[PDB]
C-alpha cells in the first residue's frame, strides 16, 4: 500500500470547510431548473435598490406607517435643519432598518458610496427651494443654513424637479469603515434646510410630505461574515 | 554549511512580505474609550457629549510601533464599536438609539455643551450610527499640514500634529431609564509610509 501519513487536522470537522462527501442518493433524477424571473447572484445587489428611510422614529410615529412621511410644517425660518441624518450606519438607529442597513448587519466592514433620493409629494402647483447638504466625516453636523450652505450641498427646487438625488462620496480614513457602536465615528451628515420656504397656490394644504430613499452604489462592498440572531 | 568568510551575508532574500511597512501597521488597535449617556438627569459632567482629541499618544501598543520612525504619512481608517446597557437596577425600557459621531478636521472649533451651534456644522463630517448593527467606519486621509506627520518634532513653537477631534453624543431625547454607552475607537493606519528610523524608546511612556 501507498505509504501515507496522517498530519494534524484529521478527524476534525470544520464548520466552514469545503470537502466532497458521499452522495446519499445515487442517480436521483433532479428536476432541472427554469428561468423563474429574478435570479440573484450576490447580496450586495439587494442594497443596489433604494428603500424608504424611516426618518421619524418618534414615540407615537415610530412603528406606525407615519415613520416615513417627513412633514414640511407651517413654521418659521428657524435655521434648525428640517432633517439631519447621521451617516453612521449602526451608530445611528435610523439607517439600520433600511434594506441597505439590513445587509450591513451581516458584515463588519463597508466601503463605497451611498446615494440619497428625495421624492417630494406636494401639490403640483406648490413650489419652493430646499437645501440638501452633506458634511464630511468628523465635522459637526451643520446647525445653521449658511454653515451647511458652505459644505457639499444641492439647492433642490421643488417647483422644477420632484425627485432629488445627492450621491454621498467615500471620503474615508481607512480602507474599510465599521458597522459597530464602539465609538461614534461620525461619518457624513445628510441635512435638509429651508432655502427659501414653501409657496402654495390659493388654499392648498400648507403641510405636504416628502420621502427619502437610500441605496448602495455599484462600488459598494462588504466583508467578514458575522451575524446576530436571538431568542 | 559551517562557513565563516566575511562575504556580504550568504544568499538573497527568502520572502519577507508580512514584515513590510504596510503589513507591520495593518493591525487596528484600540486608541481610546469614550463614555456617553442619555441623562434625564442633569449630569453636566457626562452630559451626553464626550470629546476626545485624536492622538495615538494615549495608547502604548500603537505608540512604540509608530515611534520606530521619525516621519510618516498615513491614510487613517477609524472603526466605532458602540456598546450600551442600562445603568439603574430597573426593568426600565428603551427604543433602539442613534448616536452621532463627529470627525472634526484639525484646527476647527471644538464642541463643548452638547447643545451649541458647533454641533450642526455645515462643514464637519458626521456619522449617524443606529445601534445594533455593524460598527461605523470613516477614512480620513493624510490630514497633515506638512509633508509628513512629525513623530518627534525637534525645535520650538506638546501638540505633536493634530489628527482632529471626535465628539459623540446620543441624538434621542431624555429617556426615563438612563442608558450608558461606551464608544471604542479603532485606528488602522493604511497606505502608511515612513522615513528616518530611530532607536526604539526602551522605557515607560
Amino acid at each position, epitope marked *: 500500500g501507498l505509504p501515507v501519513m496522517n498530519t494534524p487536522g484529521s478527524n476534525q470537522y470544520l464548520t466552514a470547510d469545503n470537502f466532497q462527501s458521499p452522495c446519499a442518493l445515487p442517480e436521483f433524477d433532479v428536476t432541472p431548473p427554469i428561468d423563474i424571473p429574478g435570479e440573484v447572484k450576490n447580496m450586495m445587489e439587494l442594497a443596489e435598490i433604494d428603500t424608504m428611510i424611516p426618518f421619524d*422614529l*418618534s*414615540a407615537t410615529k415610530k412603528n406606525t406607517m407615519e415613520m416615513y412621511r417627513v412633514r414640511l410644517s407651517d413654521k418659521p425660518h428657524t435655521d434648525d*435643519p428640517i*432633517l*439631519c441624518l447621521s451617516l453612521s450606519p449602526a451608530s445611528d438607529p435610523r439607517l439600520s432598518h433600511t434594506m441597505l442597513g439590513e445587509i450591513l448587519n451581516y458584515y463588519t466592514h463597508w466601503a463605497g458610496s451611498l446615494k440619497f433620493t428625495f421624492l417630494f409629494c406636494g401639490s403640483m402647483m406648490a413650489t419652493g427651494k430646499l437645501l440638501v447638504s452633506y458634511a464630511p466625516p468628523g465635522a459637526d453636523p451643520p*446647525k445653521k443654513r449658511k454653515e451647511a450652505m458652505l459644505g457639499t450641498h444641492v439647492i433642490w427646487d421643488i417647483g422644477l424637479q420632484s425627485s432629488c438625488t445627492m450621491v454621498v462620496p467615500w471620503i474615508s480614513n481607512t480602507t474599510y469603515r465599521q458597522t459597530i*457602536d464602539d465609538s*461614534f465615528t461620525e461619518g457624513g*451628515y445628510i441635512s435638509v434646510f429651508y432655502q427659501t420656504r414653501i409657496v402654495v397656490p390659493l388654499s392648498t394644504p400648507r403641510e405636504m410630505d416628502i420621502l427619502g430613499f437610500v441605496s448602495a452604489c455599484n462600488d459598494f462592498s462588504v466583508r467578514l461574515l458575522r451575524d446576530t440572531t436571538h431568542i | 554549511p559551517s562557513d565563516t568568510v566575511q562575504t556580504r551575508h550568504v544568499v538573497q532574500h527568502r520572502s519577507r512580505s508580512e514584515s513590510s511597512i504596510e503589513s507591520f501597521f495593518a493591525r487596528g488597535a484600540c486608541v481610546t474609550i*469614550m463614555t*456617553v*449617556d*442619555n*441623562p*434625564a*438627569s*442633569t*449630569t*453636566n*459632567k*457626562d*452630559k*451626553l*457629549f*464626550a*470629546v476626545w482629541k485624536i492622538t495615538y499618544k494615549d495608547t502604548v501598543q500603537l505608540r512604540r510601533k509608530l515611534e520606530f520612525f521619525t516621519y510618516s504619512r498615513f491614510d487613517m481608517e477609524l472603526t466605532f464599536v458602540v456598546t450600551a446597557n*442600562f445603568t*439603574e437596577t*430597573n426593568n*426600565g425600557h*428603551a427604543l*433602539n*438609539q*442613534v*448616536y*452621532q459621531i*463627529m470627525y472634526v478636521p484639525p484646527g476647527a472649533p471644538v*464642541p463643548e*455643551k*452638547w*447643545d*451649541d451651534y458647533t*454641533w450642526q456644522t455645515s462643514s464637519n463630517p458626521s456619522i449617524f450610527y443606529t*445601534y445594533g448593527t455593524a460598527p461605523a467606519r470613516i477614512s480620513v486621509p493624510y490630514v497633515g499640514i506638512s509633508n509628513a506627520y512629525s513623530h518627534f518634532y525637534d525645535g520650538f513653537s506638546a501638540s505633536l500634529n493634530d489628527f482632529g477631534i471626535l*465628539a*459623540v*453624543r*446620543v*441624538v*434621542n*431625547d*431624555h*429617556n*426615563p431609564t*438612563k*442608558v*450608558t*454607552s461606551k*464608544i471604542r475607537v479603532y485606528l488602522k493606519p493604511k497606505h502608511i509610509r515612513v522615513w528616518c528610523p530611530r532607536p526604539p524608546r526602551a522605557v515607560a511612556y
Partner: nanobody
Framework: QVQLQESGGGLVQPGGSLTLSCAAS????????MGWFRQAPGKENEGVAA????????TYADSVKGRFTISRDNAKDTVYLRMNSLKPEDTAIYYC???????????????WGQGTQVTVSS
C-alpha cells in the same frame, strides 16, 4: 441600545416649576444633542427645548422660552428641564430625545423616551 429614562413627570397647577430628567446609556452625552417634544392632547408633536452638552448651545420654543430652562450634566449624563411657570396649554405628554442637532425639529432625532405626562391643572 441607548436608554433615556424620562423621570420627574407629575401633576402641577397653573404656575408650577417642576423639573424633568433623563440619563444617557450606550453613549456619551456630548456625542448627541438632547431635546424634548410634547404631544399636545389630540395634536401633533411640538419641539420644546434642546441643547448639546458638548459646549452647551441653548435653544427654546417660541411659547416655552424664558420660563423653561434646559441644562445638562456630563457626569451623570442627565438633562434637567426646569419647567418654570407652567401654564394650561403646557398640559402635555413630554418625551426626551437625543439629536445631532442642535434644536427643535420633528425629525433630526434618534433615540426616544418612553412617556410622561405633566398635567398643568389646578
Amino acid at each position: 441600545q441607548v436608554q433615556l429614562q424620562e423621570s420627574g413627570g407629575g401633576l402641577v397647577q397653573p404656575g408650577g416649576s417642576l423639573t424633568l430628567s433623563c440619563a444617557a446609556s450606550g453613549y456619551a452625552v456630548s456625542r448627541y444633542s438632547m431635546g424634548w417634544f410634547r404631544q399636545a392632547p389630540g395634536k401633533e408633536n411640538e419641539g420644546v427645548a434642546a441643547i448639546d452638552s458638548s459646549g452647551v448651545g441653548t435653544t427654546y420654543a417660541d411659547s416655552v422660552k424664558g420660563r423653561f430652562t434646559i441644562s445638562r450634566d456630563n457626569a451623570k449624563d442627565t438633562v434637567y428641564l426646569r419647567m418654570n411657570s407652567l401654564k394650561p396649554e403646557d398640559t402635555a405628554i413630554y418625551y426626551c430625545a437625543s439629536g445631532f442637532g442642535l434644536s427643535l425639529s420633528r425629525y433630526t432625532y434618534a433615540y426616544w423616551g418612553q412617556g410622561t405626562q405633566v398635567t398643568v391643572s389646578s
